[PDB]
């Protein structure tokens, strides 16, 4: 059966490595071939930006993938101006119940919802309900919402 | 019984003959319960059974159907035999028309099977003896009951055939009794797609 794998890789950083090497090198497809195509797919994004991928490995090891917008968590934190944590990246609240890394305004939400609406599979969802989907995730990453 | 109410479709060629209530005298019992001799004849053969009298069969030939009914649904004895008598007729009808089959798969290194004659131990003239090499010092031979046909398309595959399902499956269980599937390598005799979960080690 045509298998699928989830991967988070940099913008234009596709190479045999922990993120890409073992994720696909074990099935049988040409890992180096994928990195050649992913680079062409991502030629307008800042180098190093994380980009989730869903590569569908058809039988005979013929793969076709569809790059997806950055994670919502990475956007809220990147936009919340939260303090940088160990590892060269922002970290969310360990216990969102009390701790608060930042407070994103609704004006940011309306922009975080559109960038997530550019996807076709999510192009039909009404934008209104999409602002409340991230607000429901802000409570999980210790981010407050200021009107 | 939701199965006893379901009519029994009699396919073309099958003929059901319902006898009359009879009581075979028994000196060891003071009262024998009457039964009904039901014959199911067709292309492949003829099967007969004796059902209790309280089971009523309204054999309507114009539509080629036969429904069962009991005299009292509240009796535990009548509810049970109502469904059992129906399941047996369904097997009889589908056994004399098409026939029942059982496939045995012999897994393991050195497991074979052949179908040849053994005139020395023949219970009846021309009895077929299934010979099995199952890693035993002695050869395993079993005579197919009268009325069955055993074949071997491949060395590691047996095919039993017969009009009586109980006789076919009972014989398939006797051959499997020599090598029951083990859970470590799958070696054994599997009947009708039977499987066994293996150990990871």
């Amino acid at each position: 059966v045509e298998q699928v794998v989830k991967l988070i890789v940099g913008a234009g950083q596709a190479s045999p490595s922990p993120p890409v090497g073992p994720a696909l090198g074990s099935k049988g497809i040409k890992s180096m071939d994928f990195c050649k195509e992913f680079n062409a797919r991502t030629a307008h994004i800042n180098t190093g930006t994380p980009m989730p991928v869903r590569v569908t490995v058809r039988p005979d090891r013929s793969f076709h993938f569809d790059v997806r917008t950055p994670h919502t968590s990475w956007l809220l934190l990147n936009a919340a101006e939260a303090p940088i944590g160990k590892g060269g990246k922002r970290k969310g609240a360990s216990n969102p119940g009390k701790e608060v890394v930042g407070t994103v305004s609704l004006k940011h939400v309306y922009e975080i919802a559109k960038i997530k609406q550019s996807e076709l599979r999510l192009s039909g969802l009404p934008l209104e309900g999409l602002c409340r989907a991230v607000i429901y995730q802000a409570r999980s990453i210790g981010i407050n919402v200021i009107p | 019984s939701k199965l006893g109410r379901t009519p029994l479709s009699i396919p073309p060629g099958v003929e059901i003959t319902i006898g009359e209530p009879f009581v075979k005298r028994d000196m060891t019992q003071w009262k024998q319960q009457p039964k009904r001799k039901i014959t199911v004849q067709g292309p492949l053969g003829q099967l007969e059974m004796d059902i209790p009298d309280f089971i009523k069969i309204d054999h309507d030939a114009e539509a080629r159907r036969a429904t069962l009914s009991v005299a009292n649904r509240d009796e535990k004895e009548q509810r049970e035999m109502w469904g059992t008598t129906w399941a047996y007729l369904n097997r009889f009808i589908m056994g004399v028309s098409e026939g029942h089959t059982a496939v045995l798969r012999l897994v393991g290194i050195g497991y074979r099977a052949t179908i040849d004659t053994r005139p020395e131990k023949e219970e009846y003239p021309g009895q077929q003896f299934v010979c099995l090499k199952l890693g035993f010092s002695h050869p395993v031979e079993m005579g197919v009951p009268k009325g069955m046909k055993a074949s071997t398309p491949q060395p590691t595959r047996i095919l039993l055939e017969g009009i009586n399902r109980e006789q076919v499956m009972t014989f398939a269980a006797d051959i499997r009794r020599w090598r029951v599937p083990e859970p470590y390598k799958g070696k054994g005799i599997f009947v009708n797609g039977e499987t066994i979960k293996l150990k990871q080690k």
Partner: protein, 98 residues
């Protein structure tokens, strides 16, 4: 029901006719992946004014071409005759497998 051994089925019926019941029910049992797997299917819908007898065509991967009338047979009577032939193909495959 097993649709693995079924290659292609063609149905022509009238929806407003109560006799086309079994035709529509049979169409539902087909799995989701029957299309991409290569099983061709073409469903024709007849007008309500003119009513032609429903036609249910079936064909397996072994050349068998089944054609059962929908008006006379019920949905329960259609599946048994379908899986019946699908039962011999499975055991025949096993007998030839290995």
């Amino acid at each position: 029901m097993l649709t693995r051994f079924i290659t292609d089925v063609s149905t022509r019926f009238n929806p407003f006719s109560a006799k086309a019941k079994a035709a529509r029910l049979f169409l539902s049992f087909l799995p989701p992946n029957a299309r991409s797997n290569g099983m061709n299917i073409t469903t024709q819908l007849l007008p309500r004014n003119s009513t032609e007898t429903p036609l249910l065509y079936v064909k397996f991967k072994d050349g068998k071409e089944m054609n059962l009338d929908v008006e006379n047979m019920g949905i329960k009577s259609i599946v048994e005759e379908v899986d019946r032939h699908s039962r011999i193909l499975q055991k025949q495959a096993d007998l030839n497998d290995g």
